């Protein structure tokens, strides 16, 4: 069960300066990058072409090459009619559900706020979006050639492409990397208290279980941090526990993960 996301980020500083950059993700692994200063889309995995032939890939890329130029012109022309600086983001792709099913999306943000989506056969402003967008969305919807292309991309190309990625990238998507854990501590705010920290790093895939323990008893004070990326496509997480000084003894951190073969890591404080 995976979500394929193409993320476009465009900054328009004035009528002479703009750039558009994109990154593409399959779940939590980056599959493409497309820098403003590259003519072509870059692969960031060996399998980033999926099961598309070189001809199909080149066709697909050419359309994006045209889009990137047209997009930039459209926005510059729009700002002249209607100011700077302007940030526009697009998030498009599809979510693959079990038994062949999938749903596609194309969402657009202006100045960091979701304003427009493509839905069915047309562009729509979302409720609460500024009313000045209605007219340019009307004009965009008159372009039926663009509408039909976006329909093809969302309905056909996205799920097709992603099926091929899942097959082609199987050994990477299903890779297992073991967490390594360690313990440390800092003083707490209030007197006679300490924050114990269980650090867990290098694990893949993302799902993991980390708890402070007293024997078989979970310590419900366990405060799990956010999932933080390492630079080598593994994850980092820490879990903290506020403890009274001289109540440290008998505490352990326990880590469960798919890569460990049913043998949890247990570190003792």
């Amino acid at each position: 069960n995976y979500t394929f996301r193409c993320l476009q980020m465009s900054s328009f500083a004035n009528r002479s300066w703009s750039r558009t950059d994109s990154v593409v993700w399959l779940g939590d692994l980056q599959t493409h990058r497309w820098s403003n200063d590259s003519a072509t889309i870059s692969f960031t995995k060996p399998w980033s072409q999926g099961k598309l032939s070189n001809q199909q890939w080149e066709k697909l890329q050419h359309m994006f090459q045209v889009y990137r130029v047209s997009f930039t012109r459209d926005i510059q022309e729009l700002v002249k009619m209607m100011d700077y600086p302007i940030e526009i983001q697009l998030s498009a792709g599809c979510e693959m559900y079990p038994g062949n099913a999938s749903e596609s999306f194309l969402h657009v943000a202006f100045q960091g706020k979701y304003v427009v989506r493509f839905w069915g056969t047309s562009w729509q402003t979302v409720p609460g979006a500024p009313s000045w967008l209605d007219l340019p969305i009307k004009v965009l919807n008159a372009d039926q050639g663009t509408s039909a292309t976006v329909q093809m991309l969302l309905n056909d190309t996205c799920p097709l492409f992603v099926r091929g990625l899942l097959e082609a990238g199987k050994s990477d998507l299903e890779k297992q990397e073991k967490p390594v854990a360690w313990l440390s501590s800092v003083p707490s705010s209030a007197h006679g208290h300490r924050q114990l920290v269980c650090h867990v790093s290098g694990f893949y895939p993302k799902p993991v279980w980390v708890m402070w323990m007293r024997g078989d008893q979970e310590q419900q004070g366990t405060h799990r941090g956010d999932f933080l990326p390492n630079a080598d496509e593994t994850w980092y997480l820490q879990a903290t526990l506020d403890v009274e000084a001289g109540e440290e003894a008998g505490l352990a951190c326990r880590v469960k993960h798919s890569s460990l073969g049913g043998q949890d890591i247990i570190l003792y404080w």
């Binding site: 998030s91 960091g112 800092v186 790093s201 290098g202 956010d226 933080l228 990326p229 630079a231 980092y236």
Partner: protein
């Protein structure tokens, strides 16, 4: 405008004298223009590698910086961020214990 959050953490368990990698993960910011420096004893580390900038479900940007480092008993490491949301740079120190 959204203010960047900064988290500093090592790739491997720190051991004094042993080469490791220090990560600085910067999140929750907008607009995307940003300057990120990693510092050793207050001095800019030259070799710093950056991921491609990306953004989250909520549209805020994130980026990961990392560099090789060898922790010792006496060296301090930090990550310093300049962004239009803040009048001054924000510095977060690596604390192996935190």
């Amino acid at each position: 405008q959204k203010t960047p959050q900064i988290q500093v953490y090592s790739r491997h368990p720190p051991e004094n004298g042993k080469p490791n990698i220090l990560n600085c993960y910067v999140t929750q910011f907008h607009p995307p223009h940003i300057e990120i420096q990693m510092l050793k004893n207050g001095k800019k580390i030259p070799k710093v590698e950056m991921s491609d900038m990306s953004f989250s479900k909520d549209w805020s940007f994130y980026i990961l910086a990392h560099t090789e480092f060898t922790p010792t008993e006496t060296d301090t490491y930090a990550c310093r961020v300049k962004h239009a949301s803040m009048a001054e740079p924000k510095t977060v120190y690596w604390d192996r214990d935190m």
